[PDB]
Design a protein around this ligand. Structure first.
Ligand code: HEM
Ligand SMILES: O=C(O)CCCCCCCCCn1ccnc1
Length: 461
C-alpha cells in the first residue's frame, strides 16, 4: 500500500509532472495536490518524496536505519559504492565513521587556525585586484579549496597555479551542469541516454579528471609513506589499509581511498565557495545589511585583529546573516537522495527496499510559519525582536541523521570566519544598481547555482 501519487504513464512514468529546469518547484506543487508524502515514478525508478519539516524531520530521524541508503546518481558511476557521498554498499558505515573521527582531530583549534591562516592568502588576493572589476568565482573559491587540501594532502596552493584552477574549474562546471534539466533527465533515464551526445559526457569526463588527479596524489602518498607519521588524511587511510592486508574481506582499496578523498575535496571546495559567492551577491543587493555588519565587526573586532570562533557569541547580527545566507539560497534543495535499506512502514504506507526517498530541504528551509515571507532575504529570520540570535530547528541546510553532511562543522566555521575577514577589510561594490540585482538561481537541480556577476572590493585599511 504506497503513498498517494499521480497516475504514472508507461516507461516515462511521471516525467510530465516535473519541469526539468525546476524539480524542487515541481515537488512543492505535488505537496499541495497529494500532501506531505507522495509517490513519483521517474524512469521506472520509484521514489518517495517528503515535504515539510514534520514529514522531513520524521524521515530523517524516526526512520534512521531504514532510510540510511544512498539513491543512485549515474553521473557518478566512477564514485558509486566506494567512498562516502555516492555509496550504497556495506563499505559505507566504516569509511564514514573513520573519516569523521579523522576530520575532528585535524579540526579543537586546528580548524580555526587553518581557516585563519588561509584568510591571509585570501585577503592578499583581494587586495591584489587593486579595486578593479573581477569575477570572484575562482578567487573566493581558492580559500575553502586550500583548507580541504591541507587536511587531505598537507598541500598548499598559490592562487594562480594552473592545476589548482583546473580543479576548481571542473568542480564548478560539474555543479552548473548537474543543475541543468538535461542532467536531470540523464539521472533517471541513464541507460536510454548515456551513449548519446550531450553534456552528460562532459560531466563524466570531468568526474574522471578529478578522480585521476586525486588517484595520483594517493599513490604519491603510498610511495613516500611514513606509517609512523601521517601528514594528512590521505596517510591515515593508507595506514588503515596496511593494517588490513591479512584479510580476504577488504574494506579499503586504493580505489576506496581515492574516492573518499575526491568526495572530500570537491565537496570541501565547491560547497563553501558557492555559499560564500552567493553571500557577497546578496549583500550587494542590500547595502543597509552590509553596513550594519561593518559596524558590528568594528565594534567587536576592530580594524585589524584576526576574526575567531569566540567572536560568534558576541556578533548576533553576523550570526543571523551567515544563517540566512544558507537558509535563503537552499544550496542543495532536494537534499542528496536516500533509499530504503529495508521494506518499511511510514505513517500509514508501504515503502519497498530500493525506493529512493527524497527528504526535501528547501521545503523546510522555506517554512512560511517559521520564517514569515520565506521568499525574502531577511536577517531578522534568526533574531528575536530584541537583537539576540534566534535559533531554529528548521535550519537544516546540511540535512540531519545517519547521513548528515560530513563537513558541517568545517563549512559553518568557514562561512563565519571568512565572511568576517572579507568585510573587515573591504566593502563590496557591484557593477549594477542594488535595486537591479536578480538573486534568483540561474540553474536549479542538484544545487542552486547563483547568477554570474562581477564586483569590486574596496580596502578599509
Ligand atoms: C557549505 C555548505 C554545505 C552544504 C549545504 C552541504 C550539504 C550536504 C547535504 C544536504 C548532504 C546530504 C545529507 C543526506 O544524505 O541526507 C551532504 C552530504 C555530504 N557532505 Fe555536505 N554540504 C556542505 C559542505 C560540505 C563540506 C564542506 C564537506 C566536506 C569537507 C561536505 C561533505 C559531505 C559528504 C562526504 C556527504 C556524504 C555523507 C554520507 O552519505 O554519509 N559537505 N552535504
Ligand atoms: O565531479 C567532481 O569530481 C567534482 C564536481 C562535483 C560537484 C558537486 C558539488 C555539489 C554540492 C553538494 N554536496 C555534495 C556533498 N555535500 C554537498
Amino acid at each position: 500500500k504506497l503513498p498517494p501519487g499521480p497516475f504514472p504513464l508507461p516507461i516515462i512514468g511521471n516525467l510530465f509532472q516535473l519541469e526539468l529546469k525546476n524539480i524542487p518547484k515541481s515537488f512543492t506543487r505535488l505537496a499541495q495536490r497529494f500532501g506531505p508524502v507522495f509517490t513519483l515514478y521517474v524512469g521506472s525508478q520509484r521514489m518517495v518524496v517528503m515535504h515539510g519539516y514534520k514529514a522531513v524531520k520524521e524521515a530523517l530521524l524516526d526512520y534512521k536505519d531504514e532510510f540510511s541508503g544512498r539513491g543512485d546518481l549515474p553521473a557518478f558511476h566512477a564514485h558509486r559504492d566506494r567512498g562516502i557521498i555516492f555509496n550504497n554498499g556495506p563499505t559505507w558505515k566504516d569509511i564514514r565513521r573513520f573519516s569523521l573521527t579523522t576530520l575532528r582531530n585535524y579540526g579543537k583549534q586546528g580548524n580555526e587556525s587553518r581557516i585563519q591562516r588561509e584568510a591571509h592568502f585570501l585577503l592578499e588576493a583581494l587586495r591584489k585586484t587593486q579595486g578593479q572589476p573581477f569575477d570572484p568565482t575562482f578567487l573566493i573559491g581558492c580559500a575553502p579549496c586550500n583548507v580541504i587540501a591541507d587536511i587531505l594532502f598537507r598541500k598548499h596552493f598559490d592562487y594562480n597555479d594552473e592545476k589548482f584552477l583546473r580543479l576548481m574549474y571542473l568542480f564548478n562546471e560539474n555543479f552548473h551542469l548537474l543543475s541543468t534539466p538535461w542532467l536531470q533527465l540523464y539521472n533517471n533515464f541513464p541507460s536510454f541516454l548515456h551513449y548519446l551526445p550531450g553534456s552528460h559526457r562532459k560531466v563524466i569526463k570531468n568526474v574522471a579528471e578529478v578522480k585521476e588527479y586525486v588517484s595520483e596524489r594517493v599513490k604519491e602518498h603510498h610511495q613516500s609513506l611514513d606509517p609512523n607519521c601521517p601528514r594528512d588524511l590521505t596517510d591515515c587511510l593508507l595506514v588503515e589499509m596496511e593494517k588490513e592486508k591479512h584479510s580476504a574481506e577488504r574494506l579499503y582499496t586504493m580505489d576506496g581511498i581515492t574516492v573518499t578523498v575526491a568526495d572530500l575535496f570537491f565537496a570541501g571546495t565547491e560547497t563553501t565557495s558557492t555559499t560564500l559567492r552567493y553571500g557577497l551577491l546578496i549583500l550587494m543587493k542590500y547595502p543597509e545589511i552590509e553596513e550594519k555588519l561593518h559596524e558590528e565587526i568594528d565594534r567587536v573586532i576592530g580594524p585589524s585583529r584576526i576574526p575567531a570562533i569566540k567572536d560568534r557569541q558576541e556578533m548576533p547580527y553576523m550570526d543571523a546573516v551567515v544563517h540566512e545566507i544558507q537558509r535563503f539560497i537552499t544550496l542543495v534543495p532536494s537534499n542528496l537522495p536516500h533509499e530504503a535499506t529495508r521494506d518499511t512502514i511510514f505513517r500509514g504506507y508501504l515503502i519497498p527496499k530500493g525506493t529512493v526517498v527524497v527528504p526535501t530541504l528547501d521545503s523546510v528551509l522555506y517554512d512560511n510559519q517559521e520564517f514569515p515571507d520565506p521568499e525574502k532575504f531577511k536577517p531578522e529570520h534568526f533574531l528575536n525582536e530584541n537583537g539576540k540570535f534566534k535559533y531554529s530547528d528548521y535550519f537544516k541546510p546540511f540535512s540531519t541523521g545517519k547521513r548528515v553532511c560530513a563537513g558541517e562543522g568545517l563549512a559553518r566555521m568557514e562561512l563565519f570566519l571568512l565572511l568576517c575577514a572579507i568585510l573587515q577589510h573591504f566593502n563590496l561594490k557591484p557593477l549594477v544598481d542594488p535595486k537591479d540585482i536578480d538573486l534568483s538561481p540561474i540553474h536549479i537541480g542538484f544545487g542552486c547555482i547563483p547568477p554570474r556577476y562581477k564586483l569590486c572590493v574596496i580596502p578599509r585599511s
